[PDB]
């Protein structure tokens, strides 16, 4: 009975990990940050509304210049907007109308999309002669694509629904490194600011911290009750916030290797579909199934205002690298730029 | 502004091209096809003529799109909301697997799948077209095998008319909501016609109920 010995060993080893994490819990963020004054009420007004989509919007991503953004919808189109003047730079028709993710290259020459077809398609925006055309179809995943992020102009990391995250090579088209260890579907991921580590929330109510180069998991975080729908990375790079299906936001610390604060209110029971930080990391914007977007004080776990301008569920949310705007797509085929 | 006013009329030529292709998709009927792998979806697909397979066929100047998601093998609750809005769900169940097992017999695993799909929070007004394939072999099997293997509580003669009717009413029992949706059961043989016409009739009842919703009668 080697399995019984191995199973008992894991439980004994897990107890040591829990004891070590609790041994360093000298205080809490709420107790430490009692002194700091509240940020006060925040008023955000819809400065622009982008129209043109004829179906639900499942993903969006700001450009690195904080002016152009790409929105993916299940009407079969991938629209690139000019957020300053509401113009439409491009409208890319997809081969598969079931798209649940979108990405924008840091250089700006490429965009990516994926969905129920288990294929991540890279589109060339440079278009040396003509229009935007497909540059590569990265096949090899077993489940649906849930998130994709551009590490550089040649490397893209994708998380699929078959419990595996992958690192690709756009120029060649092969799986450079495969990340395994999850038990449920991987629903989201977030790259570090320095692009060396990335987290990945999964349906097994756990988030893991991977290493891009070596390809091995480093730290595993627990504490949620249901699936982790979305995840985001702190601007400093030593923390990350996750949003789960039981109406709660949790902030974890990489160095402390334990949960720091939780953002829950008894009046909210709707799940969370997106999280994102402000430029300074003080705010924590989160989207909900109750058609509303809430702004949380990260250092005080206090609600600081709501962004209610949508008539359906909020599915995607992002903050520009400039930090001067927030865009909130939703299922009613509308995008809104707040403040 | 000379190179800026020219960037606006390009945003307007893109705008009208989205409406032209957006009106085309409104004149199309989207159907979701489910099953238990070997239930007979392949047989049905040929009758009307990795990832998600889209099948296109037309009937009486009406365009049908039929998506199969039986090759996903993931958590259904995560991507099943993408199909919220289909006209009807074409459910295929094989009558010849009432005794075959994968443990659990193959007919019970279809009932469990049917229960989740029928009583899902996203599919409220979506009509379900339940097809019962493999009727030819099912008739022969009950002669030498008893239906009590699948349903112990069953008590009746081992006749095709009695056995088939008992199975059909067992599936409609699982529908907890008997007033918000209707199940159009049907019997399909290996070599049969008019199957596509049955789907056409079940979709028309959804279009009429959709049209009355626009005016206000519904």
């Amino acid at each position, epitope marked *: 009975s080697e399995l019984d010995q191995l199973r008992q060993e894991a439980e004994q080893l897990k107890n040591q990990i829990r004891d070590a994490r609790k041994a360093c819990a000298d205080a809490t963020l709420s107790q430490i940050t009692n002194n700091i004054d509240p940020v006060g009420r925040i008023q955000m007004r819809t400065r622009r509304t982008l129209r043109g989509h004829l179906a639900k919007i499942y993903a969006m991503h700001w450009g690195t210049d904080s*002016r*152009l953004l790409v929105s993916a919808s299940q009407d079969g189109k991938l629209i690139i907007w*000019d957020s300053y003047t509401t*113009n439409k*730079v*491009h409208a890319i028709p997809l081969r598969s109308s079931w798209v649940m993710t979108c990405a924008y290259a840091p250089s700006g020459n490429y965009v990516a999309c994926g969905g129920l077809d288990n294929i991540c398609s890279i589109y060339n925006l440079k278009t*040396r*002669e*003509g*229009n935007v055309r497909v540059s590569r179809e990265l096949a090899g995943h077993t489940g649906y694509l849930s998130c994709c992020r551009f590490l550089d102009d040649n490397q893209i990391v994708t998380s699929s629904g078959d419990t595996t995250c992958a690192l690709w090579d756009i120029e060649t088209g092969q799986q450079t490194t495969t990340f395994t260890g999850h038990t449920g579907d991987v629903m989201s991921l977030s790259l570090a600011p320095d692009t060396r580590l990335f987290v990945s929330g999964a349906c097994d109510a756990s988030a893991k911290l991977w290493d891009v180069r070596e390809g091995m998991c480093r730290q595993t975080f627990t504490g949620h009750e249901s699936d982790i729908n979305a995840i985001c990375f702190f601007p400093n790079g030593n923390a990350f916030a996750t949003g789960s299906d039981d109406a709660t936001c949790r902030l974890f610390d990489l160095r402390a290797d334990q949960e720091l604060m939780t953002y829950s209110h008894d009046n909210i029971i709707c799940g969370i579909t997106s999280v994102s930080f402000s430029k300074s990391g003080r705010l924590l914007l989160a989207g909900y199934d109750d058609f509303n977007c809430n702004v949380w004080d990260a250092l005080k776990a206090d609600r600081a205002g709501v962004l209610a301008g949508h008539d359906n569920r909020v599915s995607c949310l992002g903050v520009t690298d400039d930090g001067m705007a927030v865009a909130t797509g939703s299922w009613d085929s509308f995008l809104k730029i707040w403040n | *502004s*000379a*190179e*800026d*006013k*020219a*960037a606006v*009329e*390009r945003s307007k*030529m893109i705008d009208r091209n989205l409406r032209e292709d957006g009106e085309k998709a409104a004149r199309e009927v989207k159907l979701l096809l489910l099953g238990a792998g070997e239930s007979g979806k392949s047989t049905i697909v040929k009758q009307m003529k990795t990832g998600i397979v889209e099948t296109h066929f037309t009937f009486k100047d009406l365009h049908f799109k039929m998506f199969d998601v039986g090759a996903q093998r993931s958590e259904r609750k995560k991507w099943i909301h993408c199909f919220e809005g289909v006209a009807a769900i074409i459910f295929c169940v094989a009558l010849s697997d009432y005794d075959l097992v994968l443990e659990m017999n193959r007919m019970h695993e279809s009932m469990k799948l049917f229960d989740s799909i029928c009583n899902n929070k996203w599919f409220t007004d979506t009509s379900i077209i339940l097809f019962l394939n493999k009727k030819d072999l099912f008739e022969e099997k009950i002669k030498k095998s008893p239906l009590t293997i699948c349903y112990q509580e069953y008590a009746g003669s081992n006749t095709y008319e009695e056995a088939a009717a008992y199975i059909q009413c067992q599936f409609e029992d699982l529908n907890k909501r008997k007033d918000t949706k209707e199940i159009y059961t049907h019997f399909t043989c290996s070599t049969d016609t008019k199957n596509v016409q049955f789907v056409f009739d079940a979709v028309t009842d959804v279009i009429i109920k959709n049209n009355l919703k626009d005016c206000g009668l519904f």
Partner: single-chain antibody, 226 residues
Framework: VESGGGLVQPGGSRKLSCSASGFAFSSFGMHWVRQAPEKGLEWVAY????????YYADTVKGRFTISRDDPKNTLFLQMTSLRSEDTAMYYC??????????????WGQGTTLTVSSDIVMTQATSSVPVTPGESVSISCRSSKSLLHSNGNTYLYWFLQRPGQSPQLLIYRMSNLASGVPDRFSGSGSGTAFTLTISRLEAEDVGVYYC?????????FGAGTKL
């Protein structure tokens, strides 16, 4: 690529045709810039994408007529009444307009035919020593400020090697066109603009033109031979 055109004729009428080749002609606005046998370039006409806005030069407002046909990828220019002034070499130029686009990127081979207010660009310098291996700066001036409210100054720099069609080096104030080596640079202030070359090579010999894109009756700058 693109080529095609007519021939010479005495005081009559003729049709000019340009044939696109594999660059999605249906989404490109096309111009009909023309160049005199010895003088500089001069704008003639323009037709947008989808045959929307159409503009004409002051001297060819009524005599000329432009048209396009996205099927078969052909651009048409109809000329009815021709005087002794309209004898020149006619170029076809493509241009696409969005936020980060680079208009006037590709120029046609060009055809010649003989018959037998606005913003003016100064470009005072007209001759520079041909000595290579050093840095040469080309300056230009405009009648009115080319800086717009949005914040970008519309000024394009073209290079015309002797024998070939003009090529675009710098679109707008400083952005460098694709396929152009990094020795070219552009700095300006809204009315005064300069072009800088770091290391002159044998391939940089030619005539450098300027162009404005603020008001559509646009004008060139008579060139500057090196």
């Amino acid at each position: 690529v693109e080529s095609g055109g007519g021939l010479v004729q005495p005081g009559g009428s003729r049709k000019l045709s340009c044939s696109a080749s594999g660059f999605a002609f249906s989404s490109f606005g096309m111009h009909w810039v023309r160049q005199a046998p010895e003088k500089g370039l001069e704008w003639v006409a323009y037709i947008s994408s989808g045959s929307g806005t159409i503009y004409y030069a002051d001297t060819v407002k009524g005599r000329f007529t432009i048209s396009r046909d996205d099927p078969k990828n052909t651009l048409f220019l109809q000329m009815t009444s021709l005087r002794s002034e309209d004898t020149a070499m006619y170029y076809c130029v493509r241009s696409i307009y969005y936020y980060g686009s680079s208009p006037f990127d590709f120029w046609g081979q060009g055809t010649t035919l003989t018959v037998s207010s606005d913003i003016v660009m100064t470009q005072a310098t007209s001759s520079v020593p041909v000595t290579p291996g050093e840095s040469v700066s080309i300056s230009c001036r405009s009648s009115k400020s080319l800086l717009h409210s949005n914040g970008n100054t519309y000024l394009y720099w073209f290079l015309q090697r002797p024998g070939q069609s003009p090529q675009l080096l710098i679109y707008r104030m400083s952005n460098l066109a694709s396929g152009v080596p990094d020795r070219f640079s552009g700095s300006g202030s809204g009315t005064a603009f300069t072009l800088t070359i770091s290391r002159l090579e044998a391939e940089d010999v030619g005539v450098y033109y300027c162009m404005q894109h603020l008001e559509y009756p646009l004008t060139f700058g008579a060139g500057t031979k090196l």
